[model samples]
Target: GSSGSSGIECVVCGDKSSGKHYGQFTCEGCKSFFKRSVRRNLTYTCRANRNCPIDQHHRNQCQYCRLKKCLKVGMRREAVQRGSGPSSG
Candidate 1:
């Protein structure tokens, strides 16, 4: 996944992608956020509807929506990088 996905919108939050972060094109914010999220074995829940709006302005507001979006968007499970030893996507 060196080339990354070909979309201006981040797959997780619809933010502008700097390049492919892990499995697809994502902004730096979501890229680092995904790393943190997966590295910690974290889980999240939504307070309201599961359809929270995730964007550059409001990404940290809801972890549930943000995480599910990444999974639902076809982000590679094996590509979910760990400590950077061998591979990421």
Candidate 2:
């Protein structure tokens, strides 16, 4: 039998949150941070060649300086939940 899904905490900060738009439970801090980044279409350029660490305390360490690191480290927005729907063409 499949175990029912339990609430997911933020992998970065371990804060509990309701999984609404995102598939996992994340604190308002990380949620807002991601939303702002996506909304502003932020780009990051790392001075450390994608070796920088990203966490709740240091997410803003760099803007255009963290894209590579974010991607390489698997910080994906797709991991979030998408509302249930289907397109009929």
Candidate 3:
């Protein structure tokens, strides 16, 4: 499954957002990681003001900034809500 699978580019952070959890566009995983940060209460705080970058590769490097950018780029807060049980995390 290490092929350059395809899809629309993510406007969220401009990063690869699909299977490969690795992005074999040469990678080995598809990172279409639709994890709900809100529901998971996944706190991503950058203590002491250690702000991080929010670019394609960098956002994934910084969770705090990633959440910040996710919203900054228009990822609705209400969108992460789930009426079902816990996700398959």
Candidate 4:
């Protein structure tokens, strides 16, 4: 029961993954969300239980759990290059 699927699905959500992002299989949507979320040091609270069900269909419902899941799935926060964009160089 511990089989890991190596398909092209996002680890965070069931959406089709664009590719690996921050050391995890992730879609463009989730990837952008994580990047922006981390960069801004965003915080969110769960309206429901902390263990909100996160998926492609209802991911936007809980930002807190969603980000938490991202980290749980091995999306390295340190891997996300911080400070100044490419244009700043």
Candidate 5:
């Protein structure tokens, strides 16, 4: 896990985060993207759902909302540093 650096804030929720997980610092948006993508192997489906509304409160209901947010918030997949080794757990 990462330790939240004093200067860094979460991109999604603007909350503090533990920066130890990766060499670089990131906000909540980037953190969530990283976690979700890794955990679920999330592949977005851009259906007619584009017309759907998304907000901080209800963003979890649809993949469209999450994927759009990731792009809108400027989360860069390239910025994620590769782990040196597989997790023992």
Candidate 6:
């Protein structure tokens, strides 16, 4: 038996990961972002190159790229809880 040593880093923005959320290791920021985006069906248009880099340094610079990387890294949309009413945090 051995302890797992997997580094928990955000797959979307490189922030210190909170835990496995939406089927991937991601920080709270990206987690909430994805939840909100999916909940509201938000749309974003990239202002820079479509392939803008998404990291801690510029994760906020481009929502399109950030969301793209979130999906690219395998964050699943079906995992997000669904309900029209908001619940207390």
Q: Which candidate ranks first by TM-score, i.e. highest?
A: 6
What is the per-residue lDDT of model 2 for residues 1-89, given as tens digits with 9 covering 90 to 100? Answer: 85565665555454454444344445676666654675455765556665455455554555443333333434555543255444344
Please tell me which predicted candidate would have the highest lDDT against the true structure.
6
Please write out the lDDT profile of model 6 over residues 1-89, one tens digit for every residue: 65565568898888878999988999999999987986676888898888777878663558888877777899977677654545555
In each prediction, how many residue pairs overlap at the backbone (N, C-alpha, C within less than 3 A)? 0, 9, 13, 0, 14, 0
**TM-score, cand. 6 vs. native:** 0.77
Better of 3 and 5 by TM-score: 3
- C-alpha TM-scores of all predictions: 0.70, 0.46, 0.49, 0.76, 0.43, 0.77
Encode model 4's per-residue lDDT on 1-89: one tens digit a residue.
Answer: 95676657888877888888888988988888887887676887887788877788873657888887889898876667754435333
Residue 5 CA error for candidate 3 (Å)? 15
- Which stretches of candidate 3 lie above 4 Å from their native place? 1-7, 16-34, 48-51, 58-60, 82-89
22-58: candidate 1 lDDT, tens digit per residue: 6778778777677677766588888869977877776
Better candidate by TM-score, 1 or 6: 6
Every candidate's lDDT: 0.71, 0.49, 0.47, 0.78, 0.52, 0.80
Give the local distance difference test score of model 2.
0.49
Task: Give lDDT tens digits, candidate 5, residues 1-89.
Answer: 78755776544444454453333344565566665774554676767646555444444545655555554566544444354434445
Task: Show pairs that collide, candidate 4.
Answer: none
- Between candidates 4 and 6, which one is better according to lDDT? 6
Ranking by lDDT: 6, 4, 1, 5, 2, 3
- Decoy 3 TM-score against native: 0.49
Task: Give stretches of model 5 more than 4 Å off.
Answer: 1-30, 38-41, 83-89
Q: Specify the poorest-scoring 10-residue window by lDDT in model 6.
A: 80-89
